[PDB]
Amino acid sequence: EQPELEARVKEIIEVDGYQFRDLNDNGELDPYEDWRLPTPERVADLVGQMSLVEKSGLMLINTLNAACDPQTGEFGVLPAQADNYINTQHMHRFVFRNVVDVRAEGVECTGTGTPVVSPAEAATFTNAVQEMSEATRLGIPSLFKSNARNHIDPAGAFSAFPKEAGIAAAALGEQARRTGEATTGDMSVVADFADVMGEEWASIGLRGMYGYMADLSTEPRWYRTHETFTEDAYLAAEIMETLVQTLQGEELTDNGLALSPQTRVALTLKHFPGGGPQELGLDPHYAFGKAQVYPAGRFEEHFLPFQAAIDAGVSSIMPYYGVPVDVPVVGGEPGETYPHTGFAFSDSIVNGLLRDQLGFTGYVNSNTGIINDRAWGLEGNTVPERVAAAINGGTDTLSGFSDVSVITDLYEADLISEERIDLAAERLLEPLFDMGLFENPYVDPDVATATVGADDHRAVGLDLQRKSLVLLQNEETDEGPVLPLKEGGDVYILGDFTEETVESYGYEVTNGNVAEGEERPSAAGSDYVLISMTAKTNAGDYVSDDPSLGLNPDHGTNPSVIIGDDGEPLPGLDGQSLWGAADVCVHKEGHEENPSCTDNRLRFGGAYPWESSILDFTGMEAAESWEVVPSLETIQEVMAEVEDPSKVILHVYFRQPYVLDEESGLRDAGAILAGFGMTDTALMDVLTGAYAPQGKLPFALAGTREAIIEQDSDRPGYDETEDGALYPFGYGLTYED
Ligand SMILES: O=C(O)[C@H]1O[C@@H](Oc2ccc([N+](=O)[O-])cc2)[C@H](O)[C@@H](O)[C@@H]1O
Ligand SMILES: [Zn+2]
Ligand SMILES: [Zn+2]
Ligand SMILES: [Zn+2]
Ligand SMILES: [Zn+2]
Ligand SMILES: [Zn+2]
Ligand SMILES: [Zn+2]
Ligand SMILES: [Zn+2]
Ligand SMILES: [Zn+2]
Ligand SMILES: [Zn+2]
Ligand SMILES: [Zn+2]
Ligand SMILES: [Zn+2]
Ligand SMILES: [Zn+2]
């Protein structure tokens, strides 16, 4: 019966033989402080007692990073904005964005450089924030959310696993290993990762996640494929179900939400109803990228993962910024289509589809920066108009919005009903009660130290690293198959490889990695060439209103067409405009003056929009916004210096479904592997034969740029193209002895 309580500001009070927290400091026990009652009564009693300002502060979630004290050397102190956020704007939801790791030696507190904090320091911080949260009138606790933290970047003190697609690769391979085919995967893998993730996240007081992504990799040109698990909706649905089950728990509430005091991380799945199918793979962070198009009519397939997660009881949902072009309303009259606005602002999507068609009973967390920079379809509207559109659309809380007064102003102008704010407040409080945060919101900082990156947890990560590796090609020489490596030999390395780790497996290693001026050693006479390569975008120079870039007619036009519901095409998106024209800094359609460029610098990722279909390595070499690392020119020199290319072994990281074009020569390598982020002991363990490769492609790889241009952004695979797939979904070799 009696749950554990902790209180740093308020007092505890003995009642009816049990203990309770006196969170309103009134000396008697309110129903909302009475953990014996079911959540609906505590919420109802709590909302009853809340100011108009208290209820609307819940509808904000913003960054609240740990700071350091430059005079004391202490890390994990509140920043300056904490006071204004918790006391003035009455916020209880934050995004924690610091890296968690051991700081190198000599690293002292600077100022305002979002510091790296240790596990104990991070928990110190979130405890401090809860202490200030408890200091409010009603002592409502806070929830922190964060983007993912347990994936290698080709980190911190969080246990390192491969990237999302790498986890699916491991799950497909483990199914194949034990059954024979790779369809929906073996979720024992997924559960193991999520279990390590849960304990580590909860141990530092981080109980929410902006994620995981339920999006599908159906458009290889979408830069966000790097955070996608698969292109297969049905595999996606099983991973989502498993993530929710492991991270949130399997006890649902009467309301159908997987929420309990043992819920370690409540998920806010994203990006509803599916960020994947982007026209030309252009991303709707950017004005040119507003469109989501569905040539194969797969809109329903893309939200299957969300239905799986909703049915398992996901806590929260983030709609995307995209605009669903010409998409039949689900469960609606023939001919009816969803509004040509960003999902976050379309009531038919956040209330129609999500809640009435799909049955979701939780809250809706907007994506970040919609009201000011990305209210697609509301380019003309004002900010209060945009806020009201989202809230009345069904969004309950706004990420990156920090002026509570605007919400209150809209209520006092009857632009938002009080029932609606009450309805938000209800949905936002429900998880906090169920997750036990009204009983104890604190954590032990010593225990984060023993938890984040514990040896056993990193063991699970290394296990998944080795099972994520996909072996795509393995020439059979006259001396046998290229992989596994024979013992000993001269090995040439190119690309990010730690020489000592390769060397410790018994090879004498030449390093082809040199500074830009220095003379690269030749590769001739090597027994093995280990190349580790990838492709990266370098588009920081993009500017929407530069006649050399965004408004350069020599860069083509934006074939994307979104006809607004005012009967008009949206600016820059009529089908014959310059790439930079969709940006507000060109069309100016805002109620503002001399507006700034949203798209400048392409800070979030992605190539120049006119280069987004260049996924073949030879093109990427020659492109302006693409860089092959290491240079394809260096690789080709190296693959020649060894006169048999069967001695070459390519570890490729497929950040996006890159295309090994036949002209590049990379298919001449003796073995090709797809890695999804792994340490070099993991990679060398597999290469030298200590473990055999078992992962399977969680997405298909094409062998022609042409197939990239023809494929259907909403459709998996390349089976509908003239050239087809180089490697299908679910492919992967092993060794056989
Ligand atoms: O963290 C946030 O507040 C949210 O930011 C939003 O925009 C970004 C997208 C990509 C990157 N990036 O790749 O750098 C940075 C920001 C995302 O749509 C959302 O998924 C995320 O949860
Ligand atoms: Zn009583
Ligand atoms: Zn009380
Ligand atoms: Zn409050
Ligand atoms: Zn199922
Ligand atoms: Zn787009
Ligand atoms: Zn009134
Ligand atoms: Zn443990
Ligand atoms: Zn030696
Ligand atoms: Zn020209
Ligand atoms: Zn150019
Ligand atoms: Zn496709
Ligand atoms: Zn052809």
Coordinates of C-alpha atoms in Angstrom, one line a residue, residues 172-475:
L172 CA 16.1 -9.0 -38.1
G173 CA 19.3 -11.0 -38.0
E174 CA 18.4 -12.7 -34.8
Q175 CA 15.0 -13.7 -36.2
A176 CA 16.7 -15.0 -39.3
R177 CA 19.3 -16.9 -37.3
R178 CA 16.8 -18.7 -35.2
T179 CA 13.9 -19.1 -37.7
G180 CA 15.3 -18.7 -41.2
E181 CA 13.6 -15.5 -42.6
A182 CA 13.7 -11.8 -41.7
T183 CA 10.2 -10.4 -41.5
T184 CA 9.1 -8.7 -38.3
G185 CA 12.3 -9.3 -36.2
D186 CA 13.1 -10.7 -32.8
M187 CA 12.1 -8.1 -30.2
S188 CA 14.1 -9.8 -27.5
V189 CA 16.9 -7.7 -28.9
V190 CA 14.8 -4.5 -28.8
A191 CA 13.7 -5.3 -25.3
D192 CA 17.3 -5.7 -24.1
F193 CA 18.4 -2.3 -25.4
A194 CA 15.3 -0.5 -24.1
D195 CA 15.8 -2.1 -20.7
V196 CA 19.4 -0.7 -20.5
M197 CA 18.1 2.6 -21.7
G198 CA 15.3 2.7 -19.2
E199 CA 17.3 2.2 -16.0
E200 CA 20.0 4.7 -17.2
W201 CA 17.5 7.4 -18.1
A202 CA 15.3 7.0 -15.0
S203 CA 18.4 6.9 -12.7
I204 CA 19.2 10.5 -13.5
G205 CA 15.6 11.7 -13.2
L206 CA 14.9 11.8 -17.0
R207 CA 11.4 10.3 -17.3
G208 CA 10.4 11.5 -20.8
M209 CA 11.6 11.1 -24.3
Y210 CA 11.1 13.2 -27.4
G211 CA 10.9 9.9 -29.3
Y212 CA 11.5 7.3 -30.3
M213 CA 10.8 8.0 -34.0
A214 CA 8.1 5.7 -35.6
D215 CA 8.9 7.2 -39.0
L216 CA 9.7 4.9 -41.9
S217 CA 12.7 5.1 -44.2
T218 CA 10.4 4.9 -47.4
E219 CA 12.2 8.0 -49.0
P220 CA 16.0 7.4 -49.1
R221 CA 16.5 11.1 -49.8
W222 CA 15.1 12.1 -46.4
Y223 CA 18.1 13.2 -44.3
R224 CA 16.3 11.9 -41.1
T225 CA 16.7 8.2 -42.3
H226 CA 19.6 8.3 -39.8
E227 CA 17.1 8.1 -36.8
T228 CA 14.7 5.6 -38.5
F229 CA 14.5 1.9 -37.4
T230 CA 13.2 0.6 -40.8
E231 CA 11.4 1.2 -44.1
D232 CA 9.0 -1.7 -43.2
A233 CA 5.9 -0.5 -41.4
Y234 CA 5.3 -3.9 -39.9
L235 CA 8.7 -4.2 -38.5
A236 CA 8.4 -0.6 -37.3
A237 CA 5.1 -1.6 -35.5
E238 CA 6.8 -4.4 -33.5
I239 CA 9.7 -2.2 -32.5
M240 CA 7.4 0.5 -31.4
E241 CA 5.2 -1.9 -29.4
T242 CA 8.3 -3.3 -27.7
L243 CA 9.9 0.0 -26.9
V244 CA 6.6 1.2 -25.3
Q245 CA 6.2 -2.1 -23.4
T246 CA 9.8 -2.1 -22.1
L247 CA 10.2 1.6 -21.4
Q248 CA 6.7 2.5 -20.2
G249 CA 5.6 -0.9 -18.8
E250 CA 2.8 -3.3 -19.5
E251 CA 0.2 -2.2 -16.9
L252 CA -2.2 0.0 -18.7
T253 CA -4.6 2.2 -16.8
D254 CA -8.4 2.4 -17.1
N255 CA -7.6 5.2 -19.6
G256 CA -5.5 2.7 -21.6
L257 CA -2.1 4.3 -21.0
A258 CA 1.0 2.4 -20.0
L259 CA 1.7 4.5 -16.9
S260 CA 2.9 3.3 -13.5
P261 CA 5.4 4.4 -10.9
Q262 CA 7.8 1.9 -12.4
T263 CA 7.3 3.6 -15.8
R264 CA 11.0 4.5 -16.4
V265 CA 10.6 6.7 -19.4
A266 CA 7.3 7.9 -20.8
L267 CA 7.5 8.1 -24.6
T268 CA 6.3 10.9 -26.8
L269 CA 6.3 9.1 -30.1
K270 CA 7.1 11.1 -33.2
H271 CA 6.5 12.3 -35.8
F272 CA 2.7 11.6 -36.1
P273 CA 1.4 10.4 -38.4
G274 CA 4.6 9.7 -40.3
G275 CA 7.5 12.0 -41.2
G276 CA 8.9 9.5 -43.7
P277 CA 7.3 10.2 -47.1
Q278 CA 8.8 13.6 -47.9
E279 CA 8.6 14.9 -51.5
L280 CA 12.0 14.6 -53.0
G281 CA 13.1 13.8 -49.5
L282 CA 13.1 17.5 -48.7
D283 CA 12.4 18.0 -45.0
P284 CA 9.7 20.3 -43.6
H285 CA 12.0 22.0 -41.1
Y286 CA 12.6 24.1 -44.3
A287 CA 10.1 26.0 -46.3
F288 CA 10.9 24.3 -49.6
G289 CA 10.2 21.0 -47.8
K290 CA 6.6 21.4 -46.6
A291 CA 5.2 18.6 -48.7
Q292 CA 4.5 15.0 -47.8
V293 CA 3.3 13.1 -50.8
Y294 CA 1.8 9.6 -51.1
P295 CA 2.0 8.3 -54.7
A296 CA 1.4 4.7 -53.5
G297 CA -1.4 5.7 -51.2
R298 CA 0.4 4.4 -48.1
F299 CA -0.7 7.0 -45.6
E300 CA -2.4 4.3 -43.6
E301 CA 0.8 2.0 -43.6
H302 CA 2.9 4.9 -42.3
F303 CA 0.8 5.4 -39.1
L304 CA 0.6 1.6 -38.4
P305 CA 3.6 2.0 -36.0
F306 CA 1.7 4.7 -34.2
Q307 CA -1.4 2.5 -33.8
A308 CA 0.8 -0.2 -32.4
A309 CA 2.4 2.2 -30.0
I310 CA -1.0 3.8 -29.1
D311 CA -2.5 0.4 -28.5
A312 CA 0.4 -0.4 -26.2
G313 CA -0.3 2.8 -24.3
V314 CA 2.2 5.4 -25.5
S315 CA 2.0 8.4 -23.2
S316 CA 2.2 11.2 -25.7
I317 CA 2.5 12.0 -29.4
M318 CA 4.4 14.6 -31.5
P319 CA 2.8 15.7 -34.9
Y320 CA 5.2 16.6 -37.6
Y321 CA 5.6 19.8 -39.5
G322 CA 4.8 18.3 -42.9
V323 CA 1.7 19.1 -45.0
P324 CA -0.2 16.0 -46.3
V325 CA -0.8 16.7 -50.0
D326 CA -4.1 15.3 -51.4
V327 CA -4.6 12.6 -48.7
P328 CA -8.0 11.0 -48.3
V329 CA -9.5 11.6 -44.8
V330 CA -9.6 8.3 -43.0
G331 CA -13.1 7.3 -42.0
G332 CA -14.5 10.3 -44.0
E333 CA -16.8 10.8 -46.9
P334 CA -15.4 10.0 -50.4
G335 CA -13.4 12.8 -52.0
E336 CA -12.7 14.5 -48.6
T337 CA -9.0 15.3 -48.0
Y338 CA -7.0 16.5 -45.0
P339 CA -6.2 20.3 -44.9
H340 CA -3.1 21.4 -46.7
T341 CA -1.6 22.6 -43.4
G342 CA 1.1 21.2 -41.1
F343 CA -0.2 18.3 -39.1
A344 CA 0.2 20.1 -35.8
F345 CA -2.5 22.7 -36.9
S346 CA -5.0 20.4 -38.6
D347 CA -7.8 19.5 -36.2
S348 CA -8.8 16.6 -38.5
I349 CA -5.4 15.1 -37.9
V350 CA -4.7 15.6 -34.1
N351 CA -8.4 15.2 -33.1
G352 CA -9.9 13.4 -36.1
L353 CA -7.3 10.8 -37.0
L354 CA -5.2 10.4 -33.8
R355 CA -8.0 10.4 -31.3
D356 CA -11.3 9.5 -33.0
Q357 CA -9.9 7.2 -35.7
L358 CA -6.9 5.7 -33.8
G359 CA -8.2 6.0 -30.2
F360 CA -5.3 7.8 -28.6
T361 CA -6.3 9.0 -25.1
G362 CA -3.1 10.9 -24.0
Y363 CA -1.6 14.2 -24.8
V364 CA -0.1 15.9 -27.9
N365 CA 3.3 17.6 -27.7
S366 CA 3.9 19.9 -30.6
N367 CA 7.1 19.8 -32.4
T368 CA 9.6 22.7 -31.7
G369 CA 9.3 26.1 -33.3
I370 CA 6.0 25.7 -35.2
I371 CA 4.4 29.0 -34.0
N372 CA 7.1 31.3 -35.2
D373 CA 9.1 29.7 -37.9
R374 CA 7.1 26.7 -39.3
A375 CA 3.3 27.1 -39.2
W376 CA 2.9 25.7 -42.7
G377 CA -0.4 26.7 -44.2
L378 CA -0.6 29.6 -41.7
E379 CA 2.1 31.7 -43.3
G380 CA -0.2 34.7 -43.3
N381 CA -1.6 34.3 -39.8
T382 CA -0.3 36.0 -36.7
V383 CA 1.4 34.2 -33.8
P384 CA -1.7 34.2 -31.5
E385 CA -3.6 32.9 -34.4
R386 CA -1.1 30.1 -34.9
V387 CA -1.1 29.2 -31.2
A388 CA -4.9 29.0 -31.2
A389 CA -4.9 26.9 -34.4
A390 CA -2.6 24.3 -32.7
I391 CA -4.4 24.2 -29.4
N392 CA -7.9 24.0 -30.9
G393 CA -6.4 21.6 -33.4
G394 CA -5.8 19.3 -30.4
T395 CA -2.2 20.0 -29.5
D396 CA -2.0 20.3 -25.7
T397 CA 1.5 21.7 -25.2
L398 CA 3.9 23.8 -27.2
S399 CA 7.6 23.0 -27.5
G400 CA 9.9 26.0 -27.8
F401 CA 7.1 28.4 -26.8
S402 CA 7.7 30.4 -23.6
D403 CA 5.3 33.3 -23.3
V404 CA 2.4 32.0 -21.2
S405 CA 0.8 35.5 -21.4
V406 CA -0.1 34.8 -25.1
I407 CA -2.0 31.7 -24.1
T408 CA -3.8 33.7 -21.4
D409 CA -4.3 36.6 -23.7
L410 CA -6.1 34.3 -26.2
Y411 CA -8.4 33.0 -23.4
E412 CA -9.2 36.5 -22.3
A413 CA -10.0 37.3 -26.0
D414 CA -12.1 34.0 -26.1
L415 CA -9.8 32.6 -28.7
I416 CA -9.4 29.5 -26.6
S417 CA -12.1 28.2 -24.3
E418 CA -11.6 27.5 -20.6
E419 CA -12.9 24.0 -21.1
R420 CA -10.1 23.4 -23.7
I421 CA -7.3 24.6 -21.3
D422 CA -8.9 22.4 -18.6
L423 CA -8.9 19.5 -21.0
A424 CA -5.2 20.2 -21.7
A425 CA -4.4 20.5 -18.0
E426 CA -6.2 17.2 -17.4
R427 CA -4.2 15.3 -20.1
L428 CA -0.9 16.8 -19.0
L429 CA -1.4 16.0 -15.3
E430 CA -2.5 12.4 -15.8
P431 CA 0.9 10.9 -16.6
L432 CA 2.6 12.7 -13.6
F433 CA 0.1 11.1 -11.1
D434 CA 0.3 7.7 -12.7
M435 CA 4.1 7.7 -12.9
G436 CA 4.2 8.4 -9.1
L437 CA 5.8 11.8 -9.5
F438 CA 3.3 13.3 -7.0
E439 CA 4.7 10.9 -4.3
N440 CA 8.4 11.2 -5.0
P441 CA 9.9 13.2 -7.9
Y442 CA 13.5 12.9 -6.7
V443 CA 16.4 10.5 -7.4
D444 CA 19.6 9.5 -5.7
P445 CA 22.7 11.0 -7.5
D446 CA 25.1 8.4 -6.1
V447 CA 23.0 5.7 -7.8
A448 CA 23.2 7.3 -11.3
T449 CA 26.9 6.9 -10.9
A450 CA 26.6 3.1 -10.4
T451 CA 24.0 2.9 -13.3
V452 CA 24.9 5.1 -16.3
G453 CA 27.4 3.0 -18.3
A454 CA 27.6 0.1 -15.9
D455 CA 29.8 -2.7 -17.3
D456 CA 26.9 -5.1 -17.8
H457 CA 24.9 -2.4 -19.7
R458 CA 27.8 -1.7 -22.0
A459 CA 28.0 -5.4 -22.6
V460 CA 24.5 -5.4 -24.0
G461 CA 25.5 -2.5 -26.2
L462 CA 28.6 -4.3 -27.5
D463 CA 26.5 -7.4 -28.1
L464 CA 24.0 -5.4 -30.2
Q465 CA 26.8 -3.6 -32.0
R466 CA 28.2 -6.9 -33.3
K467 CA 24.7 -8.2 -34.3
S468 CA 23.9 -4.9 -36.1
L469 CA 26.7 -5.4 -38.6
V470 CA 25.4 -6.5 -42.0
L471 CA 27.7 -8.4 -44.4
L472 CA 26.6 -7.5 -47.9
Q473 CA 29.3 -9.1 -50.1
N474 CA 32.0 -11.7 -49.5
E475 CA 34.0 -12.7 -52.5

